[PDB]
Design a protein around this ligand. Structure first.
Ligand SMILES: Cc1ncc(COP(=O)(O)O)c(C=O)c1O
Ligand SMILES: Cc1ncc(COP(=O)(O)O)c(C=O)c1O
Lengths: 411, 412
């Protein structure tokens, strides 16, 4: 066979396996070939299942129709997003926190922003992550050349600072043990533990970044699931504006997982060591590497941030929070240590003396329920399994009855 | 003021100015402050102006409504795109060229794919570009670290092979003079020159890439504007499957500039030097750095690839081709050497012995028409201005009447 003379990107070779979620999808597909009539219930990837509220879809349908008219047609939009949407985001989520419309950048989702932020930061920064955490932070770091190879003894990539988060520390790292890095990725409520940092803990985090001259990338994608009285935005901590940016999404709030609409906020006072504003470089990246979120998706997001939109999202969130309680009760009554579920739509279940890939396979084989192995979120995830609360009520109820039946005489 | 201790990305520092199109927007604004009552006509950025066909927007509205129903709701899609859409793309545009559904990757636009491909290739490859060409290829290369500093003497970033395309070489590089690189970005019909490579030229291109062991990134975003009998896909050249990929969009076909939907095709036989298939690394990128094109946008694209969708896109394209003819005739009758226009919805007008930024400024100053200076597309664009044919008919006719009044004493 012919081969080119182009060298494969050595950062791609570093990656230890495929991305977590497609690999779960692969195993689900294999299972369905093995048992074509299996009634599979999917609680692995956190994919929303309930319809998008009509007030939101009507707005998208209306925009689509307007595109067929002379007066309603629009072409390229500003890569930063429509001004009225940036304004609605700024006031709805950051009103009174000193965030301006120009600090908000509308994206086609938070996953995409994590990678565009990483292009911006470039190959020469070092990163810290919660351990466990959402796998995109680590993988985007490897892709951009910020790391060494995967070390199989400790299950870590070289040159990444993995901050230890455990049941024992309430899933917040001991910052006195964490080494200095350029960037700190911090998710609250955290995926997969469900842990939400308190005001005191976030104050420690900002003080730590300030002393270290670090940039916090704060992921608030589950913040509207907060039940405890904790801050929902990093900008609620005075001084955050000098050290932090925030990324979020409509995915988990309006069921926009397939519609594609999120945002990032980068404050005016966030500067590199030469004084250059970080926001200006992010603007260059989005003007060069992106052409804006879909106009229809933007029209949907605008409808979300109205009294009727917020009421509709609140209801959807409430439904999923009810699902979470069902799942919590099931595993608790079976005698497992169960974490999270209070401030997030998933639960983090401890399975001692088994690898989480083995647990995943066993649950899928015996109950036809898809979960997420905890090791997929980093080495501190080993021995845990994440179970999503996103599903139709009847499916959540059925998955729990399957779990109880399997584990009742054994645990 | 407080500053972090994080070093600015040295590749961002390398960039010479802002992206071209935001810079034009800046000058347009400043012009409106100077002339508050001016009736500005924009023939600058290639932004579509006519409504999307109803057959297509109806499909998008229907999908939106379906998302409000139990049965019609869908969440995350395959990051690679809906299978029926990959299948429709593969058959409509590549039927008989040996492209499978699994070789097609649906995106939210060609501009985004170019930068995702650049993340995949990484910082250690070298690139070649047409000179002139669409500025994202160069700028994405600088951002990824593939270049040296900008040299102001020659107006070029170090370590990029700029392949000069001129009236004297028929707007196709003299490949015998082009140095070896890893990647060759090649756009046909070309933006900004409008030139479409012939079957013979593309054959030379594939032969060149094969001998150099290069990967061609073929940009066909204007291929449906083809009037001459020239190939529309690189995969029409036997051997292309070993050295080429293709990136395209619905932007210029259905007015999807704001809707956001494109694709990239990477064939099975395209391998890095260690035998690893390039498509597998692109798949890792789009599964890690992207979460799929919008479901609504995909439903619109699926509706494009039907008898009714194709007829409607044909009509839209035909309207812009007629605008292009109006513009060509105007500059021709004014005594200018005018290029492109035949196979693409823009015209590449020669203004020799002037700086193109100066010509840009003069046209805007006197006629209130925005164009694009050729040097925004690289040093090989110096001496030319690109004029877009995207506009309402009355706006095209009015711009042409203003050009005629501006330039009537230049030639007899
Ligand atoms: C922790 C976390 N970060 C980022 C994302 C990416 O979200 P998006 O759907 O907007 O691309 C997700 C998925 O919802 C997530 O759970
Ligand atoms: C030559 C060329 N390539 C790529 C693009 C990007 O297209 P988009 O992101 O709208 O799909 C354009 C603009 O239409 C272009 O002119």
């Amino acid at each position: 066979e012919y081969k080119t003379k182009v060298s494969r990107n050595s950062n791609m070779s570093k990656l230890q396996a495929g991305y977590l979620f497609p690999e779960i999808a692969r195993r689900r597909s294999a299972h369905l070939l093995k048992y074509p009539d299996a009634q599979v219930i999917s609680l692995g990837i956190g994919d929303t299942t309930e319809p998008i509220p009509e007030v939101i879809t009507s707005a998208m349908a209306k925009k689509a129709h307007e595109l067929s008219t002379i007066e309603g047609y629009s072409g390229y939009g500003a890569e930063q997003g429509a001004k009225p949407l940036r304004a609605a985001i700024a006031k709805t989520f950051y009103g009174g926190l000193g965030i301006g419309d120009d600090d908000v950048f509308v994206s086609d989702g938070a996953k995409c922003d994590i990678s565009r932020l990483q292009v911006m930061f470039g190959s020469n920064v070092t990163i810290a992550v919660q351990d466990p955490s959402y796998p995109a932070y680590v993988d985007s770091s490897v892709i951009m050349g910020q790391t060494g190879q995967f070390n199989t003894d400790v299950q870590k990539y070289g040159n990444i600072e993995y901050m230890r988060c455990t049941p024992e520390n309430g899933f917040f790292p001991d910052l006195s043990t964490v080494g200095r890095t350029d960037i700190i990725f911090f998710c609250s409520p955290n995926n997969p533990t469900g842990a939400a940092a308190t005001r005191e803990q976030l104050t420690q985090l900002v003080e730590f970044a300030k002393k270290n001259g670090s940039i916090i990338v704060y992921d608030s994608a589950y913040a509207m699931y907060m039940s405890d009285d904790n801050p929902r935005s990093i900008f609620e901590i005075p001084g955050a504006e000098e050290v932090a940016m925030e990324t979020a999404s409509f995915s988990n709030y309006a069921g926009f997982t397939g519609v594609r609409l999120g945002w990032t906020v980068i404050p005016k006072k966030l500067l590199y060591s030469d004084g250059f504003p970080v926001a200006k470089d992010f603007n260059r990246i989005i003007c060069t590497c992106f052409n804006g979120a879909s106009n229809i998706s933007q029209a949907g997001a605008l409808a979300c941030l109205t009294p009727e939109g917020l009421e509709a999202m609140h209801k959807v969130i409430g439904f999923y929070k009810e699902n979470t309680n069902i799942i919590i009760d099931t595993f608790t009554s079976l005698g497992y240590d169960v974490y999270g579920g209070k401030n997030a739509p998933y639960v983090w279940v401890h399975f001692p003396n088994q690898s989480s890939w083995d647990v995943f396979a066993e649950i899928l084989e015996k109950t036809h329920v898809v979960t997420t192995p905890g090791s997929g979120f980093g080495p501190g995830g080993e021995g845990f399994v994440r179970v999503s609360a996103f599903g139709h009520r009847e499916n959540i109820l059925e998955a729990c009855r399957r779990f109880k039946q399997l584990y009742k005489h054994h645990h």
